[PDB]
Enzyme design. Structure first.
Site, PDB file in Angstrom:
ATOM      1  N   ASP A  25       0.824  -1.210   0.000  1.00  9.31           N
ATOM      2  CA  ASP A  25       0.000   0.000   0.000  1.00  9.31           C
ATOM      3  C   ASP A  25       0.861   1.264   0.000  1.00  9.31           C
ATOM      4  O   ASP A  25       1.233   1.760   1.068  1.00  9.31           O
ATOM      5  CB  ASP A  25      -0.926  -0.044   1.216  1.00  9.31           C
ATOM      6  CG  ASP A  25      -1.955   1.063   1.202  1.00  9.31           C
ATOM      7  OD1 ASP A  25      -1.895   1.948   0.330  1.00  9.31           O
ATOM      8  OD2 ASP A  25      -2.823   1.042   2.073  1.00  9.31           O
ATOM      9  N   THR A  26       1.129   1.822  -1.187  1.00  9.27           N
ATOM     10  CA  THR A  26       1.918   3.053  -1.253  1.00  9.27           C
ATOM     11  C   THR A  26       1.192   4.255  -0.658  1.00  9.27           C
ATOM     12  O   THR A  26       1.841   5.263  -0.344  1.00  9.27           O
ATOM     13  CB  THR A  26       2.300   3.374  -2.693  1.00  9.27           C
ATOM     14  OG1 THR A  26       1.114   3.445  -3.498  1.00  9.27           O
ATOM     15  CG2 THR A  26       3.226   2.299  -3.251  1.00  9.27           C
ATOM     16  N   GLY A  27      -0.122   4.188  -0.522  1.00 14.64           N
ATOM     17  CA  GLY A  27      -0.849   5.272   0.094  1.00 14.64           C
ATOM     18  C   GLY A  27      -0.874   5.235   1.604  1.00 14.64           C
ATOM     19  O   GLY A  27      -1.547   6.050   2.244  1.00 14.64           O
TER      20      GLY A  27
HETATM   21  C1  LIG Z   1      -6.979   0.875   3.836  1.00  9.09           C
HETATM   22  C2  LIG Z   1      -6.827   0.405   2.409  1.00  9.09           C
HETATM   23  C3  LIG Z   1      -7.292  -1.045   2.307  1.00  9.09           C
HETATM   24  C4  LIG Z   1      -7.656   1.285   1.449  1.00  9.09           C
HETATM   25  N1  LIG Z   1      -7.444   2.715   1.476  1.00  9.09           N
HETATM   26  C5  LIG Z   1      -6.288   3.129   0.823  1.00  9.09           C
HETATM   27  C6  LIG Z   1      -5.075   3.430   1.696  1.00  9.09           C
HETATM   28  O1  LIG Z   1      -3.982   3.496   0.808  1.00  9.09           O
HETATM   29  C7  LIG Z   1      -5.266   4.778   2.543  1.00  9.09           C
HETATM   30  C8  LIG Z   1      -5.315   6.093   1.703  1.00  9.09           C
HETATM   31  C9  LIG Z   1      -5.406   7.296   2.588  1.00  9.09           C
HETATM   32  C10 LIG Z   1      -4.306   8.135   2.878  1.00  9.09           C
HETATM   33  C11 LIG Z   1      -4.420   9.243   3.750  1.00  9.09           C
HETATM   34  C12 LIG Z   1      -5.645   9.532   4.373  1.00  9.09           C
HETATM   35  C13 LIG Z   1      -6.746   8.709   4.095  1.00  9.09           C
HETATM   36  C14 LIG Z   1      -6.630   7.605   3.228  1.00  9.09           C
HETATM   37  N2  LIG Z   1      -4.290   4.859   3.540  1.00  9.09           N
HETATM   38  C15 LIG Z   1      -4.499   4.559   4.854  1.00  9.09           C
HETATM   39  O2  LIG Z   1      -5.566   4.284   5.397  1.00  9.09           O
HETATM   40  O3  LIG Z   1      -3.352   4.610   5.614  1.00  9.09           O
HETATM   41  C16 LIG Z   1      -3.345   4.644   7.009  1.00  9.09           C
HETATM   42  C17 LIG Z   1      -2.119   3.898   7.533  1.00  9.09           C
HETATM   43  O4  LIG Z   1      -1.013   4.773   7.285  1.00  9.09           O
HETATM   44  C18 LIG Z   1      -1.451   6.117   7.522  1.00  9.09           C
HETATM   45  O5  LIG Z   1      -0.939   6.907   6.428  1.00  9.09           O
HETATM   46  C19 LIG Z   1      -2.034   7.371   5.620  1.00  9.09           C
HETATM   47  C20 LIG Z   1      -3.328   7.201   6.483  1.00  9.09           C
HETATM   48  C21 LIG Z   1      -3.004   6.085   7.475  1.00  9.09           C
HETATM   49  S1  LIG Z   1      -8.795   3.720   1.559  1.00  9.09           S
HETATM   50  O6  LIG Z   1      -8.388   5.068   1.326  1.00  9.09           O
HETATM   51  O7  LIG Z   1      -9.483   3.494   2.775  1.00  9.09           O
HETATM   52  C22 LIG Z   1      -9.857   3.194   0.177  1.00  9.09           C
HETATM   53  C23 LIG Z   1     -10.941   2.320   0.364  1.00  9.09           C
HETATM   54  C24 LIG Z   1     -11.768   1.863  -0.645  1.00  9.09           C
HETATM   55  C25 LIG Z   1     -11.596   2.229  -1.985  1.00  9.09           C
HETATM   56  B1  LIG Z   1     -12.569   1.698  -3.107  1.00  9.09           B
HETATM   57  O8  LIG Z   1     -12.524   2.128  -4.397  1.00  9.09           O
HETATM   58  O9  LIG Z   1     -13.524   0.765  -2.774  1.00  9.09           O
HETATM   59  C26 LIG Z   1     -10.501   3.110  -2.216  1.00  9.09           C
HETATM   60  C27 LIG Z   1      -9.658   3.558  -1.169  1.00  9.09           C
END
Ligand SMILES: [C][C]([C])[C]N([C][C]([O])[C]([C]C1=[C][C]=[C][C]=[C]1)[N]C(=O)O[C]1[C]O[C]2O[C][C][C]12)S(=O)(=O)C1=[C][C]=C([B]([O])=O)[C]=[C]1
Ligand SMILES: [Cl-]
Ligand SMILES: [Cl-]
Ligand SMILES: [Cl-]
Lengths: 99, 99
Positions: A25-27
């Site tokens: 997860d690069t995000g």
């Molecule tokens: C959790 C993952 C399984 C899905 N996510 C994507 C992640 O990359 C998410 C992206 C992100 C980044 C910053 C703030 C908020 C969110 N980062 C995340 O939570 O990181 C946490 C752990 O480290 C910290 O740093 C960053 C926040 C903290 S999601 O955004 O919830 C998502 C869900 C469904 C769909 B769909 O199309 O159904 C698309 C996206």
């Protein structure tokens, strides 16, 4: 490897001798894993996701193997929908994004 | 380019005639953008992550330029804390994770 993104970039991880599935997860700044037992002391951390902020337990210097690559670093434990390998450990295994 | 992950992989995108900064996010199935107007039809959707679910508007066949590469696909619009370029568009610009 070179991982394309047509499906979720899931890998097998090994933490505490148990195999688990996790998402590259690069995000994600941080690595966060569903509730499990880990050794040592922990510290409080608040992380903000798409739906808001949650409280997790921060364990440092945890041994973890990711898609076969050894890492040692911080693991957050809490109510995440899936195990996510964040940038703190992606950097340790040498992962980059390319296009 | 090759993007290291020491810091958040933020890039400039053009969507709906506006410039925005967005995260290249291998952990996101779909692209999620903060509140903005887009033309055409949309339908409501619920998406969940860390912290729970948010309600979004789903627009299909939206063109986005990502770091200079044009892609087309579905864009979810709603109260996300960060603009997220998910796999549905990362594939179109040929993005891979390499280690
Ligand atoms: C959790 C993952 C399984 C899905 N996510 C994507 C992640 O990359 C998410 C992206 C992100 C980044 C910053 C703030 C908020 C969110 N980062 C995340 O939570 O990181 C946490 C752990 O480290 C910290 O740093 C960053 C926040 C903290 S999601 O955004 O919830 C998502 C869900 C469904 C769909 B769909 O199309 O159904 C698309 C996206
Ligand atoms: Cl770390
Ligand atoms: Cl799409
Ligand atoms: Cl391809």
């Amino acid at each position: 490897p070179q991982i394309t993104l047509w499906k979720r970039p899931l890998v097998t991880i090994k933490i505490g001798g148990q195999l688990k599935e996790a998402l590259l997860d690069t995000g994600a700044d941080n690595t966060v894993i569903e509730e499990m037992s880990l050794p040592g002391r922990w510290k409080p951390k608040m992380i903000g996701g798409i739906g808001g902020f949650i409280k997790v337990r921060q364990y440092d210097q945890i041994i973890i193997e990711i898609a076969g690559h050894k890492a040692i670093g911080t693991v957050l434990v809490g109510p995440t929908p899936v195990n996510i390998i964040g940038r703190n450990l992606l950097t340790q295994i040498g992962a980059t994004l390319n296009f």
